[PDB]
């Protein structure tokens, strides 16, 4: 169906321990395909998905030049933000940037993204119009003014509507056997007595791609949102993801509970019960 490409930049200062580290990673949907790390013995852009390996040496050198120049500029930016906030030269700080493009099931540009954070708090964002900025505070307004003066948004728009979309479509074709394949969850329900009159029902979803999934428990057809323990979706390490949802139920009432699974890889939404 729908698809996205995202780059994630993390720049981390560390006073007394060298220059700020810059890390860039690229994803198509829930698949990482590239990395760069300024701390590596020989910093270079590296493949992280098999379908990107076919790209020529000019691709890899272009990426490396981009990430190397960004490394330098992010170090300047970290110094700038430390100043904007009147911060001591003694603390470690982090700039993060996420950007990229979304496609619909056509797939044409649905929307572009470009957002930054400082120390884990939203700092500045490109608006959906790809023309204007939202600044979080007076410090970010300084960043806004110099991006407005340098016509940054104009460059962002040209990239997000052009090359971002073009290369995403290219990756989606080159990696179609995985990127355009949804693996449904493998599901089952476990039962764990906790006491004489309560037991845990745990609904498992395993081996699914992409990570987007809904697991819900119902009692008599009514969702148990407040009583459902829901873990964060977690990677298996083989491209696939895992999740569970659990409810503590009165013993003997197990059959009044149904687990419901929604995933794009499923022919139909699933309804599961405990099978003694």
């Amino acid at each position: 169906g729908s698809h996205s490409m995202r780059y994630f930049y993390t720049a981390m200062s560390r006073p007394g321990r060298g220059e700020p580290r810059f890390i860039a990673v690229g994803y198509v949907d829930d698949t990482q395909f590239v990395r760069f790390d300024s701390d590596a013995a020989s910093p270079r852009t590296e493949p992280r998905a098999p379908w990107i390996e076919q790209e020529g040496p000019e691709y890899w050198d272009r990426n490396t030049a981009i990430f190397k120049a960004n490394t330098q500029t992010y170090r300047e930016s970290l110094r700038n933000l430390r100043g904007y906030y009147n911060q001591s030269e003694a603390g470690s700080h982090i700039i993060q940037r996420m950007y990229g493009c979304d496609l619909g099931p056509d797939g044409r540009l649905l929307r572009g993204h470009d957002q930054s954070a400082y120390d884990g708090k939203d700092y500045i964002a490109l608006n959906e119009d790809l023309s204007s900025w939202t600044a979080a505070d007076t410090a970010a307004q300084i960043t806004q003014r110099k991006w407005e003066a340098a016509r940054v948004a104009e460059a962002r728009r040209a990239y997000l509507e052009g090359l971002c979309v073009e290369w995403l479509r290219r990756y989606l074709e080159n990696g179609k056997e995985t990127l355009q394949r949804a693996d449904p969850p493998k599901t089952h329900v476990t039962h764990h007595p906790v006491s004489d009159h309560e037991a845990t029902l745990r609904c498992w979803a395993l081996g699914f791609y992409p990570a987007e999934i809904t697991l819900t428990w119902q009692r008599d057809g009514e969702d148990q949102t407040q009583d459902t323990e829901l873990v964060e979706t977690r990677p298996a390490g083989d491209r696939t993801f895992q999740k569970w949802a659990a409810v503590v139920v009165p013993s003997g009432e197990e059959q009044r509970y149904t687990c419901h699974v929604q995933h794009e890889g499923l022919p139909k939404p699933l309804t599961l019960r405990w099978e003694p």
Binding site: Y7, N70, T73, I95, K146, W147, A155, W167
Partner: peptide, 13 residues
Amino acid sequence: LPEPLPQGQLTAY
């Protein structure tokens, strides 16, 4: 593919 470098220099924050 990441955002290519502009003609001049990258604009810092």
